Amino acid sequence: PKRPTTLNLF
Amino acid sequence: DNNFYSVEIGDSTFTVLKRYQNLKPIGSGAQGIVCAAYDAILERNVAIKKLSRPFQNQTHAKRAYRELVLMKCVNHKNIIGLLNVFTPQKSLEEFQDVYIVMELMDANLCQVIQMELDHERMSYLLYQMLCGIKHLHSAGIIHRDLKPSNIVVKSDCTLKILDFGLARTAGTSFMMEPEVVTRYYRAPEVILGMGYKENVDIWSVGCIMGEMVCHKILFPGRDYIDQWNKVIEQLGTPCPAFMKKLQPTVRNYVENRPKYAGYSFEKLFPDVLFPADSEHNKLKASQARDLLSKMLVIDASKRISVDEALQHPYINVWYDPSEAEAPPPKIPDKQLDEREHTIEEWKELIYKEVMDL
């Protein structure tokens, strides 16, 4: 269960 | 002066050592005016905050200083990064104002509260958030002002806390001046002028996570007093034990309010609002809700804790001692400043605290 790497804030 | 230079920011001026070239306002706050810029040296954009009235009075000081120290004295992967702190004037005499410099994150948690999400991302962000809090806490330091506008994120999915002006320790007595700690997220013990303990910060992380799920604010009061009316209408009127904990005066008003049953958390927070629960256990709407209902609790005494939160079935899925147990930050004990030193004496501690660092 890995940590996310991207967060589309746009 | 010769290396600094002012720019035209809002209805005000901004003097920053030239290296900080390219000022674009981004933060208007009782805290201070804040704008991003490109550091010609560091070669990476940064954040410059001008202390709005450092010594406007006894309180501004106690906080201007309280932040400086705390920015310095505290290092953690999830607490904003302190990169500098300069001042234009040259003498204690002329010492007028101070600009702080901290790393610059991409966006806001407000920006986050405006987009759906998946258990994985939401879960992790609340983790990072609980991590930076465990830090301040682990050294007896409280933030008392965790709202979205005080949480910054990035495209790599990380989070760091902010503003430490109100950040302090143990509320030896009711927040005499919660006037500052923003309404919508004010904690019951703060509203009803009690006395705050460590976990007050956890109440905030309650409203905050609730806002991320509802996408709208949880307890939308229309004034400092109506705020209570929204807390009880949702969560319900407080048991008598709690009411016996209120000052004799707050007690009355609080008991003269209509009685409120409150709705259950499976109602305030229906599944459909929670990320698309996938077959898996750890990350489920139900547990998201269980954590929620353990923070959104009127009675601090009976309210969760950071250590406990960091250990909850929805957060503990990416636990790691190196973040959750990390070493507490060490203050030289400068917070001796409860003793309100005079503006001048204050301006002493300030400019100099400013100085060297």
- CA-based radius of gyration for chain A: 8
Report yes or no: B282 and B313 within 8 Å, Cβ to Cβ: yes
Of A1, A4, A9, the CB nearest to B106: A9
Of B73, B72, B70, B92, residue with least CA distance to B82:
B72
| Distance from C-alpha of B93 to C-alpha of B101, rounded to nearest angstrom | 23
DSSP conformation class of A4:
P
Residues of chain A with Cβ-Cβ distance to B317 below 8 Å are 1
- CA-based radius of gyration for chain B: 21
The overall longest dimension of chain B from CA atoms, in Å, is 66
Resolution (A): 3.0
Block residue for tokens 């229906």: B270
- The domains located in chain B, with CATH, are 1-106 (3.30.200.20), 107-326 (1.10.510.10)
Judged by CB atoms within 8 Å, which residues 1-10 of A form the interface with B?
Answer: 1, 3-9
| Distance from C-alpha of B296 to C-alpha of B293, rounded to nearest angstrom | 5
Residues of chain A with Cβ-Cβ distance to B121 below 8 Å are 4, 7
Of A4, A5, A9, the CB nearest to B107: A9
Q: Helix/strand/coil (H, E, C) string of chain B?
A: CCCCCEEEECCEEEECCCCEEEEEEEECCCCEEEEEEEECCCCEEEEEEEECCCCCCHHHHHHHHHHHHHHHCCCCCCECCEEEEECCCCCCCCCCCCEEEEECCCEEHHHHCCCCCCHHHHHHHHHHHHHHHHHHHHCCCECCCCCHHHEEECCCCCEEECCCCCCECCCCCCCCCCCCCCHHHCCHHHHCCCCCCCCHHHHHHHHHHHHHHHCCCCCCCCCCCHHHHHHHHHHCCCCHHHHCCCCHHHHHHHHCCCCCCCCCHHHHCCHHHCCCCCCCCCCCHHHHHHHHCCCCCCCHHHCCCHHHHCCCCCCHHHCCHHHHCCCCCCCCCHHHHHCCCCHHHHHHHHHHHHCCC
Of B107, B112, B155, the CB nearest to A6: B155
CB-based contacts of B135-138 (< 8 A; 24+ apart in sequence): B135/B74, B135/B76, B135/B78, B135/B79, B135/B326, B135/B328, B135/B329, B136/B74, B136/B79, B136/B161, B136/B167, B136/B201, B136/B329, B137/B198, B137/B201, B137/B306, B138/B326, B138/B328
| Distance from C-alpha of B342 to C-alpha of B36, rounded to nearest angstrom | 33
| Distance from C-alpha of B92 to C-alpha of B349, rounded to nearest angstrom | 10
Does B134 appear as a known binding residue?
Answer: no
Residues of chain B with Cβ-Cβ distance to A5 below 8 Å are 156-157
Give me the amino acid identity at B143: H
Of B184, B262, B166, residue with least CA distance to B224:
B184
Pairing mode, if any, of strands B20-27 and B32-39? antiparallel
**Number of CB pairs, chain A paired with chain B, less than 8 A apart:** 34
CB contact under 8 A, A7 and B283: no
Block residue for tokens 């406990």: B308
Exp. method: X-ray
CB contact under 8 A, A7 and B318: no
Q: How far is B281 from chain A, CA to nearest CA, in Å?
A: 11
